[model samples]
Target chain A: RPWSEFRLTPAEAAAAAALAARCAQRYDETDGPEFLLDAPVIAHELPRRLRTFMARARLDAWPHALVVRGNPVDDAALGSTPVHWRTARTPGSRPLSFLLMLYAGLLGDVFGWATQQDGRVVTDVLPIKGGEHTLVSSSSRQELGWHTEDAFSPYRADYVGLLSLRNPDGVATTLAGVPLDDLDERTLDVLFQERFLIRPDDSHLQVNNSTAQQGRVEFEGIAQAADRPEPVAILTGHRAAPHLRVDGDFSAPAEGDEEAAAALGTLRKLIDASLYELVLDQGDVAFIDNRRAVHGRRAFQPRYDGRDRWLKRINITRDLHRSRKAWAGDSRVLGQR
Target chain B: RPWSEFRLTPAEAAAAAALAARCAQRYDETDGPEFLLDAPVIAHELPRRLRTFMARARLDAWPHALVVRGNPVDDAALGSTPVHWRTARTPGSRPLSFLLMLYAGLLGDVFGWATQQDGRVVTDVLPIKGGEHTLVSSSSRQELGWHTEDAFSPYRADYVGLLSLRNPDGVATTLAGVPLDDLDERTLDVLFQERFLIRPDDSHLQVNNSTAQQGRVEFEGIAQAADRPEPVAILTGHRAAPHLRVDGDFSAPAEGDEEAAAALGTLRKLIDASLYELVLDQGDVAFIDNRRAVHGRRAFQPRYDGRDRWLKRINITRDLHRSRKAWAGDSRVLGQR
Candidate 1:
C-alpha cells in the first residue's frame, strides 16, 4: 500500500479535537489570513507524536498518502449531512473543518481554486442529491475517476487533505501510484514526454460553483484550456522515482501523437490493475500526495438520508509562490480572472 | 524574561544530533534547495517535546524568543572557528550547520541575503581579527547595537535563529521587547505613524560581502535606501500588542521631522532601560522573534583562540512569499540583484 498510517492515542485524539474546537471558537474561517498565519503555529499544540508522524512521513520517498486515524467523531453532535456543498458549512461540522485545516497547515500552505466550490478553502465532499452521475467530488452513483487533484493546472496542490466526518457505511477512496515496476523503458520514456493534454476537470465549471462566482474570468481561462489544451508530460522529476500527473477522464494525447496515446493507454491499464482502496473511517484524516498519486472515490448509492459519508477537504501547496501568477484578489485563492 | 525555553532530555538531544549528522552526511550544503526542502520534513525526527515547544511557543503573545538547550557539542568534533564567514563552512561544523537549519525549518522558510555573507542560507557569527569593532555580527570588542534583523527592508525576517556552537565565556545577547508600559500614549502614537526612516545596515554593504558578489545590483538598492529612505512606521499591527521595526544605529526620523525624532528618541531610552541578557551556553539554540523584539550582542574581548563564542545563524520568514519582490536568482536568497 502506498500509504503510511499513524494512530493517535485516546488522549492525543481528544487534545487534537479540543484544539480545533478552540480554534473554531477564536477564528471566523480557516482560509482567512488571521487563521492561515496562525494555524501552523497553533498546530504545535497538537499531540507531539502525530505532529512528528506528519513531519517525518511527508519526507519519506514512498507513501502516497499520510493517514492519521482514531479521532472519534460524535455523530449526534455532527447532525445531518448537507444536501449541497453550498450549505455544508453547518455549525455542527465547523470544528472538524478547522481540524482539517490545522493538519493541512503542517504539510504546507492551504489554498483554494476560485473556480471551485465558490472559492472555499475548506470544501465539502459529500453526495449532492441531484449530482449523483457527475465527475466532481459531490457525485455518488458514478465512480469518481482516479486523477490528480486539479491535474491540468500548473499551480495544482501538492497534497489533497480529506477528513472523514461520517463514513459509517465504509466508502472506499481509490488511489494509484506510478506503476514504475510494470512499465517498459520505451513506454516510460514516452510517458515522460510532453505529448499528453490534460484539461481542467468539471469541478471548475460554472455550474459546479455558486452563482455569486459565476461569469468569473477564471471560467474563461478554463474554457480556453478545454478548447486549446497545451501538451505536457504525464511524468516528471527523477525517472527512477518520478512524479505522476494524469487525469483519467480529462486527459488525452496531442494531435497526431500515436506513440504518446499508446503509452498513455498502457499506463491506464497498469494503474487500473494496481489501484487499491483506502476506507477512511469516521474522524480519520488523510493527506494524499498529489505529486505521487491519483485518487478518486468509488460509486455508492445515495440514500438521501441525513446520515451519509461526508468529508472535509482542503488543498495544500509546499510553496505558495509557485502559483503567484494564478493568484486572484486573495492570496489564498488561486485562478486569475 | 520574554522567552520560552525547552531543554531536551539527553536521549532526545542525542537523537536530534544524530539526525543532523545523518543529514550532513547525505546533503552537500544546508542552504541548497535540496536540503531546504527536506530540512523541515527531516526535522520531524527531532524530539517530540522540543518540536511541540517550537510549534506552540512561537505563537504566544509574550515570548520574544524560543530557546532550546542541551544539544551537546564536542570541542574535538567542532574544530577551530574560521577567521571569516567566507571560509566558515568547515567539515567539523557541517553537522551543526545542518542542525541549526533543521531547528529553523520548524519556524518558517529559512533564507539568506544575497548582499550579506555571499548569499549563504547558513551563516556564521564569529569575531574577525581586524574587524573587532565593526557593527556587524562579527564584532567582538564593540557592542552590537540592538535592532530588528534586516530592519530596513520591508521583507525582514520574522525570526532570527542562532545556534551557539561554543560560548565558553558566557557573552550575553541583549534583547528588549516593546517598552509599552513606560511609553506615553503620545510617543506610542507617533511611533505608529509613517514618519520614521530605517536605512539598510552596514552589513548589506558591498565591503561586507565577498569580493565576487561586490558589484551586484542589490548594493545599488542598498545604497539608494541609505541615501533616500522612504518614511515608515516603527510600530504596526494591534495597538495593544504591536509589532516593532527600528534599528539602534541605522533608524532615523523623516527629514526634519522633529516629532518623529522625539518619539524615536524616547523609544531608544525606554528600550535601553528595559534591555536584558540571555546567555546561550554551548549546545544552545535560540530563535529570537524579530517582530516582537530588538536584539544585540554585548561587547567582549576576542579570544582568537581555536575556541570562541561562535554561532551558526539563519534568518526565517513566516511566509517566504512575503519577500517575493526581493527574490534574487535563487528562490531561497533574497535581494533583488
Candidate 2:
C-alpha cells in the first residue's frame, strides 16, 4: 500500500547529505563501514540541521516506520557541497543503502512483534537504465500485485522499507494501505466472516506445481475469529491501523463457500481504493506497514542509459518488548535503517 | 570391513532374544525402537547379566559384534527365526521396514558417529516396483564418485546401517572395506599422504554434476587429538590401522597425481578381500562403520511384482555427551565396545 510522499525539508536534506558524506568516506576506508547515526544525531548535529524534524514529520505516529527518499546529498557530482558523495557506482552495490535496508528490518522487531522468516527477506533491486536486464521478469517490471511476501510461511513481514538511491526515471513503487475505515460496510462484514483462503505465489507454484498445485493454504473465515484467522489475517496493535494482506490468485474461497468469495471480493475493492502512489526521487526512503498494507510496483520503461530506476528494498519487523524475551543481543540502533 | 561371524551361546542367544523382544515392543511404540538395543547397551548389560557368559566369550579381546539372522518374535511366520524384519510389498510406501532400518541407523549413532557426504543426514525414498519402467543407467543415478558419508563435512560417523526388506531375484549390493593391516608399508604411506577426490553418488550426480570436480591435491594426515582432520586428510587416524574410503567410477585422482593409480590398485585389493556379500533376505539388517568402510550395492532385477529390492535407511550421529546435550529428551544407555 502507498502513503503520501514525505519530502525532507531543505535543512533536513542538507543534514542528511552531510551524514551521507561521512558514511562514504568511512566506507571507502574499509570495504564497508557501519553507520551509527541515530535519529537524534541526524536531526540535531547534522549540517544545516532541522529542528524537531522527527516530531514535525509525525514519524512517532508510526514508531515502527522509517521513511527515506532520494535526497540531493547522495549525488556524486555535488562534490564541494560537503553533502553529496558517492559510496559505490556498481549496480546493486551501495554500502550505505545496504546498511539502511538492514536497519529497517531490525526496527520492525522494535515496533511490532515481527521476526524474520528464518533469514529470508526479499530485496527488490529496481532496474535503472543500463540494467534493463535486471527487469527480466513480469513482476520485476510490471505492477506487482498486492500480496504478502512468503505468505505460505508462518512468519511474514511486519514492516517493509525502500531506499531510493537514484530514481532518474521517476517510476513510483505504489503501496496501498487497507485501513478499516476505507472498506465498505459489506466488505467489512464479509472480511469479518473469515471466508478467505490464502495461497502462496509463483516461487511456491514452481516447487509444488508438478506434484501438487496445492501450495500451502490457510483458511481465514468465520470458524477462526473475527480479528484473526486460524493462520493469521493482518498484523494488529502497536500501531494506528491493521495491515492487510491481499492476493487474488493465491487467496480463494473454499469450495461451495459463497461467503468466502464475497469477503475476498470486498477486500479486493478496498485494496483498489487504498492505493498511495509516489514517484520517489534519489535519496528518498519509504517504510510500509507490510501487515496492514498490500504493496505493488508500477512498471516503467528504462532509457537504457547509465541512469535508471534504482531502489534498495529492505523488509523488517519490530519486536519491541518481545525481542528481549526471544533473543539475546545488543539493542541500540546501529549503522542505518 | 566385514568380520568373521562369531557364534553365540544358547544363554547369550536367549538373553539377546529377550532384549530383542523388548526392543521390538518399544520400537512399535517409539520413534526409532531398533536403535534401543545397540552395542553400548549390549556392552554395558552383558557384563552384568551374563558375567560367566562374558568370561567365556572374552568379547573384549577382539572387536565385539553380534548378529541375529532373522526376527522370529515380530515376523514369526517367515519360516526362519526373524532377528530383524523388512517389508517389500510396495514401492515408495512408508513400509514398516523403514522403521526397522531407521532403528538400525539410530543404533549406529549410539555406537559411533555416522559420517558421509556433506548432506547425507536426510534420507530419500525410492520406489522401484510401482514407478514408471525405465532401465537403470549409471547416468540415471548421479555421477559423483562415493567417499564415505561426511567425508567432506566436518563430522564423521563410526558406523552406518542399511536394512533391506526386499531383494528382487537378480540384484546384488556390493560392499568393500579395506583393511589397513593388509596394505604394503609404502602404499599405506602414500595413501595417507595423498588426497583423493570424492564425487557425489548417482542421485546427486544426475542433477548437479556438471561442474568440474574441485578439491585439494595433498592430504594432511588425520589429527589425533581432536579425532578430526588437521588440514583435513582423505585418509587419517591410526597409522598402521588407518581407515580406507574409495568408491570406484565415482572417484578420481588429480592429474599427475601418482597416488591415484596406487590408491585404485589398493582399493581393488580391498574390495576383493573385504566383501561381506549377501543377497539380502526380506528381513535383513546390516550395520557398517562408515569411517572404516566403503559400501555399494549391485543393481538388482526389479520383478515389478509389488516386491523390489526395497531397503529403508536412516542416518544419525553418536556422541553420548553431545547427543545428550542435543537431545536432552532422549534416554541414555551403555553397552559393548
Off by over 4 Å in 2: A1-6, A9-11, A20-70, A73-95, A98-124, A128-141, A149-154, A179-186, A202-231, A234-241, A254-256, A320-337, B1-337
Instruction: Please report the TM-score between candidate 1 and the true structure.
Output: 0.61
Q: Say which candidate scores most in lDDT.
A: 1
> How displaced is residue A269 in candidate 2, in Å?
2.7
Which of the numbered candidates is closest to the native, going by highest TM-score? Answer: 1
Summarize candidate 2's per-residue lDDT along A1-337 as a digit string, tens digits: 2343445677666655556455544544212212321221222233222222322222222332345544553456422111101222342334445345333522322221112111122233544333233212123345566666544333344566676666666776666655566666565655555455554454332221223312222112111322332433432332224445556446666556776676677667766776666666667776665554566667677543445555555544332221222221222211100
| Per-residue lDDT over A1-337 for candidate 1, one digit per residue giving the tens place of the 0 to 100 score | 6799999999999999999999999999887878877787677678877877887687566799999999888988999999999999998999999999989989888899989998899999999888899999999999999999999998898899999999878999999999999999999999999999999999999988888678878788788889898999999865767788999999999999999999999999999999999999999999999988999999999878999899999999876645656777667888864
Clashing pairs in 1: none
Give the range of the ten consecutive residues with the poorest summed lDDT in model 1 chain B. Answer: B318-327
Candidate 1: residue A100 lDDT (0-100)? 94
Q: What are the DockQ scores of the candidates, in order?
A: 0.07, 0.01
What candidate 1 gets wrong by more than 4 Å, as runs, is A1-80, A83-102, A107-337
Worst 10 residues of 1 chain A by lDDT: A318-327
